[PDB]
Amino acid sequence: LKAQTKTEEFDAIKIALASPDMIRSWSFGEVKKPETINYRTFKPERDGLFCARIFGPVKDYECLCGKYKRLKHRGVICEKCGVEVTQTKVRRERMGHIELASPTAHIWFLKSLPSRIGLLLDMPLRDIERVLYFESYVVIEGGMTNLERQQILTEEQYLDALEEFGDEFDAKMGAEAIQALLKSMDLEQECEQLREELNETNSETKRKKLTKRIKLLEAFVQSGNKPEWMILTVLPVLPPDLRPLVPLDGGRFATSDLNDLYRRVINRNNRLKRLLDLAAPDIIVRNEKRMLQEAVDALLDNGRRGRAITGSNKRPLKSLADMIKGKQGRFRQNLLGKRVDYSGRSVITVGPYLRLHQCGLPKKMALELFKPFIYGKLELRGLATTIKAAKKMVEREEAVVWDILDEVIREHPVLLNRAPTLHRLGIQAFEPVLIEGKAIQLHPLVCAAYNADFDGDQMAVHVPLTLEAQLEARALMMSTNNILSPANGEPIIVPSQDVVLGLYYMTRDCVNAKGEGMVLTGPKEAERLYRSGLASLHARVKVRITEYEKDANGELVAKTSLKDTTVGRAILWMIVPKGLPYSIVNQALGKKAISKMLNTCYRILGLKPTVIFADQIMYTGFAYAARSGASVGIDDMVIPEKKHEIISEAEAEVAEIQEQFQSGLVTAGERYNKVIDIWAAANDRVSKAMMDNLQTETVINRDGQEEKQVSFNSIYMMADSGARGSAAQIRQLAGMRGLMAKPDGSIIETPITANFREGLNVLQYFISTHGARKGLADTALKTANSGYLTRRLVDVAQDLVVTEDDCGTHEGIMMTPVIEGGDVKEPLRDRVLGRVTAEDVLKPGTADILVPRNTLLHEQWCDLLEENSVDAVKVRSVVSCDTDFGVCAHCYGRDLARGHIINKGEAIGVIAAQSIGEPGTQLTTGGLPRVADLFEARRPKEPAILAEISGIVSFGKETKGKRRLVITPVDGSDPYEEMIPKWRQLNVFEGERVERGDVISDGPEAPHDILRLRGVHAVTRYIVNEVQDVYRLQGVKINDKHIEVIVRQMLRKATIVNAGSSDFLEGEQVEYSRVKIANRELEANGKVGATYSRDLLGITKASLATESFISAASFQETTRVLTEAAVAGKRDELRGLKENVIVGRLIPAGTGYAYHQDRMRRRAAG
Amino acid sequence: ETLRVDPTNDRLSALVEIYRMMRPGEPPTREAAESLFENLFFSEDRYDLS
Amino acid sequence: ARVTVQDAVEKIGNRFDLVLVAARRARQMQVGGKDPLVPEENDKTTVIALREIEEGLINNQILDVRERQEQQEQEAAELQAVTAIAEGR
Amino acid sequence: GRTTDPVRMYMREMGTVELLTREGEIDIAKRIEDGINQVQCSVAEYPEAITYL
Ligand SMILES: [Mg+2]
Ligand SMILES: [Zn+2]
Ligand SMILES: [Zn+2]
């Protein structure tokens, strides 16, 4: 089979240095003139930056001179001026060149931080530049006379040396010299000699640099790049249409900055050739050569010499490097953003009538959006003669088009998105419902996922054009298909505010009301009793209900009974589907409980019933909340009657301590602490006063004299249910609010005595203002911090995707309840839920296996483990996964919007980063910067030192800067002595045995240590526990998984100890290494296998290392990455997400996983 | 100690180091250093606090 | 309309391959080479395909088989046509 | 010495050469005359240069 020649579907990409002949290969002509256009007839001057001959025809399929204007004549080169008549797009394609008179250095390889020409020649930068500017002479191929090869001389020195040695000695200067250097260089010889020298002398300083350099050399050799190519003989010119001269309004022209530069280069070059043909003196031609160097440099990358300015404008002209790099930090267009067709946006409204699987869309919007579909469908039925007439029809908006639109809309989903996109739920699919208006209607239950208020937030809409996109949206991005946050299995469809106030008001009981103590047959006549006004919504009543339990095998049991409940609960029970027990609705129904209802319902009945259930809950919530007549008046907020008294007493305390300071019984600062303490305590008192009052004060009579229950007051119900408001804010409404603190952070000792129900005076408000401003500023800052964090996270994970099914390793981490301090800051059941057991676990007695081997632990398994007393479960994690270059689904967990085990091919790194990043706005050393420090693995300010090795220790030597510590193992030797500064108070006992990783001092410790001394599981445990300590303290739920994948990406690199294949100290992928040692344990060398040591790299550091260079060019410094890759001739095979996103082909994950797989195996095979 | 770190000696020397500080790399001149230093904070033209 | 795809996800496990298979089938219907295997409710090919998955009458196996058969259904037609090309020798 | 920015490395490199005296100009011009007229005479001494004309 003939392989191929012409266009195929390409794989990978290659990058390297450019040959003069290769540069010419791209070039379809040499631009010989600085001229652009004729100045009258705007036609291009021949052989110029803009040209028809070299590049392409001005107008489609037409010659410049105008001889052949017909679409027939195509492959024809015109006799007058050769122009092959072809599409003008080719002028966007065909490149060019310029033959430079004097050699020129490529500024990217001169000025890159590790200067390439510099370290390749083992020559310093300042020397090379000094040579390039003709400031001094440099030797080349010195031979045996007096002098080195790389040695540098001066005018007089060169003269004297030449006088002594005429031949067998060589020196040049300028660019020609550096080129001569690079060309005369023999890499192989250097390889041999350097290997020898490496082998001879023993010093660290010597063989370190030695091995680094030989590695560099042989790499550059294997690349295929020859050093000469660092010096440009020929300069390629970019196609004219990529740097357009295109005109504007008012007969004004606008052109890019590349034209100014290129024109300069051409000018100075031609002038150099001219000065050569005139036999000018040395100084002149030298000045010209230097100027040419500067011009070319400014063209390539501007700002590394002089920062040349554009014509008549101060602002420095944008060079090719800036063209590539882009702006906004690192953003390459596939990053910052890209405009997209078939889209729209607008202000959003409520639409409670909507089912949760749909949403409202404006008529006009849907018309303009689906316009092509509308055309094709209009003429498919025959209502329109041709596409033209169809346009005329929809343009006139004839009455017949609306129905056709209703046709094309029906099963066709649309994508909705908000501005602050964090987690995947930031974009969700809905079924369009045509609505009269300009506003988008969005289902209330989803308002939590978007974090969208109704205060003028806008949403954007995208149309899933291709069939695959329709099915992707419907089976993945669909609202109903994600009911559960990917961070934790808890439902994100949880009812929000009005609805929960409705369900709260419904089920609740006042002491006495209509129909108190009566009995009813079923919920039907309970509701019938209520609506007729005979019975009150809340009253204690016994009613017969039929509840189901599916506890049989796949089968619903039915039982009936007389339940003691309320009218409202009875009415609400009608909604509750099937196998849910009545108990769930027999409570007060707070936001938490109303959530657990949906949860249990989902883990029992499945998806569909949970969906319809949730919908019904929303509808009834709204309806009964409406009927409730809940409102808020000025008298709804009740101030304690004892407030003024507390104020006065706490105010007596301040004058007590004041008198004490007057008499000197107490110091100033101690006084300050005292007064601040008494005021704080006062605030606590008033708070717990108004709380009790506003809470239980309702005093009502049933058949007797008195009794008292929880208040029916509005603001209380609101705060208690969880609809909105909280004890903190309610506290500020009735009782006094806090004490404020000046910007310094010094807390003022005169708190705000008044509240919002009362008036605040001038001072109090002024003092509050700072708190407000710092609030908005801090929050607006932490949004950005969160963004940056998520960015670093996705950059470090990304391409991690579920690939293999099961790696099959018994390995895993021990899962215990968190048990911090006092009782259980988080249970065992949550930590082990949805995960998979590494190995079977026992009962108190054994040979009875509850959970066999590796099995998904769902609610039933976890409750079965809860029945038994088992406190200990070993669980498989993504950090310990044996699979290389990915995670096996059997290792990850079940967690997803769906309860089933994680799918094959879903990209977990991304979702992990998103899950860690979404709550980051809700975070307050501690705090969010603490999290950032953790993932960066930064060594703290005042750390602690763990014991290096177990065994008895003692204090060695004396005081100079350190007092040495001598460790003494039981069997093995004791060379180990660590130098610990003695001015730091120690911990370790001079006479006691210390296990490795014990406390030899206090303070936090760097996780590098924990990894090295205490182990891998130990360090991952430290990271996860500390970060979870940060989040959980704020009330944020994040499963250990995501953190664990981030951790796995942190430790991806490790440094070898032993040898037998690769280099000694190389940091490398533990995937590569483990795959190579597992392969070397058998066959190959019998066992040569090399030991490594796991390394801990920070997230921002581990993000630096990526195989694909196109990926690195995205988020890193572009200028360096391109060069540093181009020298080694690095070949990017794609294989990752980011790269395939840039190149614009199907993502090697998700749906595309069936593609890249069926490809990847076809590659490197038969 | 400030004097102990001072590389200069006389007025001309100081003016040299100053003119070479403000406009470095180009050869200094007496009239140049004088004109510069006089035109920085002492010139009614190039300076004012109002 | 199909509110939740959970049933289809039950018929084929992967849930991405669900999208792929249902896509391929939906294409078989959309560019008409074929007709639905189950009553069309006015549901577009998008949903019809999913209904076909849920009924367990359509998946990767079935489709591959049908297509493989059709290749020979065409081979049978062009049997006398392509063997007439013996002029190759 | 080298501050980069070739305006300097030029400005200084040319500043080395000393200005000509009014007599030195005549010296140089005389040298020019000597050289040229030499090549002209050398051209006149070639038969082919004549026959060609
Ligand atoms: Mg808002
Ligand atoms: Zn022509
Ligand atoms: Zn695994």
UniProtKB/Swiss-Prot annotation, chain A:
<comment type="subunit">
    <text>The RNAP catalytic core consists of 2 alpha, 1 beta, 1 beta' and 1 omega subunit. When a sigma factor is associated with the core the holoenzyme is formed, which can initiate transcription.</text>
</comment>
<keyword id="KW-0460">Magnesium</keyword>
<keyword id="KW-0479">Metal-binding</keyword>
<dbReference type="InterPro" id="IPR000722">
    <property type="entry name" value="RNA_pol_asu"/>
</dbReference>
<dbReference type="InterPro" id="IPR006592">
    <property type="entry name" value="RNA_pol_N"/>
</dbReference>
<dbReference type="Pfam" id="PF05000">
    <property type="entry name" value="RNA_pol_Rpb1_4"/>
</dbReference>
<keyword id="KW-0240">DNA-directed RNA polymerase</keyword>
<feature type="binding site">
    <location>
        <position position="65"/>
    </location>
    <ligand>
        <name>Zn(2+) 1</name>
    </ligand>
</feature>
<dbReference type="GO" id="GO:0000428">
    <property type="term" value="C:DNA-directed RNA polymerase complex"/>
</dbReference>
<dbReference type="InterPro" id="IPR012754">
    <property type="entry name" value="DNA-dir_RpoC_beta_prime_bact"/>
</dbReference>
<keyword id="KW-0548">Nucleotidyltransferase</keyword>
<dbReference type="InterPro" id="IPR038120">
    <property type="entry name" value="Rpb1_funnel_sf"/>
</dbReference>
UniProtKB/Swiss-Prot annotation, chain B:
<comment type="function">
    <text>DNA-dependent RNA polymerase catalyzes the transcription of DNA into RNA using the four ribonucleoside triphosphates as substrates.</text>
</comment>
<comment type="subunit">
    <text>The RNAP catalytic core consists of 2 alpha, 1 beta, 1 beta' and 1 omega subunit. When a sigma factor is associated with the core the holoenzyme is formed, which can initiate transcription.</text>
</comment>
<protein>
    <recommendedName>
        <fullName>DNA-directed RNA polymerase subunit beta</fullName>
    </recommendedName>
</protein>
<comment type="similarity">
    <text>Belongs to the RNA polymerase beta chain family.</text>
</comment>
Swiss-Prot record, chain C:
<dbReference type="Pfam" id="PF01192">
    <property type="entry name" value="RNA_pol_Rpb6"/>
</dbReference>
<dbReference type="InterPro" id="IPR036161">
    <property type="entry name" value="RPB6/omega-like_sf"/>
</dbReference>
<dbReference type="GO" id="GO:0003899">
    <property type="term" value="F:DNA-directed RNA polymerase activity"/>
</dbReference>
<protein>
    <recommendedName>
        <fullName>DNA-directed RNA polymerase subunit omega</fullName>
        <ecNumber>2.7.7.6</ecNumber>
    </recommendedName>
</protein>
<dbReference type="InterPro" id="IPR006110">
    <property type="entry name" value="Pol_omega/Rpo6/RPB6"/>
</dbReference>
<comment type="similarity">
    <text>Belongs to the RNA polymerase subunit omega family.</text>
</comment>
<dbReference type="InterPro" id="IPR003716">
    <property type="entry name" value="DNA-dir_RNA_pol_omega"/>
</dbReference>
<keyword id="KW-0808">Transferase</keyword>
<dbReference type="GO" id="GO:0000428">
    <property type="term" value="C:DNA-directed RNA polymerase complex"/>
</dbReference>
<comment type="function">
    <text>Promotes RNA polymerase assembly. Latches the N- and C-terminal regions of the beta' subunit thereby facilitating its interaction with the beta and alpha subunits.</text>
</comment>
<comment type="subunit">
    <text>The RNAP catalytic core consists of 2 alpha, 1 beta, 1 beta' and 1 omega subunit. When a sigma factor is associated with the core the holoenzyme is formed, which can initiate transcription.</text>
</comment>
<dbReference type="GO" id="GO:0003677">
    <property type="term" value="F:DNA binding"/>
</dbReference>
Curated annotation (Swiss-Prot), chain D:
<protein>
    <recommendedName>
        <fullName>RNA polymerase sigma factor RpoD</fullName>
    </recommendedName>
</protein>
<comment type="subunit">
    <text>Interacts transiently with the RNA polymerase catalytic core formed by RpoA, RpoB, RpoC and RpoZ (2 alpha, 1 beta, 1 beta' and 1 omega subunit) to form the RNA polymerase holoenzyme that can initiate transcription. Identified in a complex containing RpoD, the RNA polymerase subunits RpoA, RpoB and RpoZ, CRP and DNA. Interacts with Rsd; this prevents interaction with the RNA polymerase catalytic core and with promoter DNA, and as a consequence, promotes transcription from promoters that require alternative sigma factors.</text>
</comment>
<comment type="subunit">
    <text>(Microbial infection) Interacts with Escherichia phage lambda antitermination protein Q.</text>
</comment>
<comment type="function">
    <text>Sigma factors are initiation factors that promote the attachment of RNA polymerase to specific initiation sites and are then released. This sigma factor is the primary sigma factor during exponential growth. Preferentially transcribes genes associated with fast growth, such as ribosomal operons, other protein-synthesis related genes, rRNA- and tRNA-encoding genes and prfB.</text>
</comment>
<comment type="similarity">
    <text>Belongs to the sigma-70 factor family. RpoD/SigA subfamily.</text>
</comment>
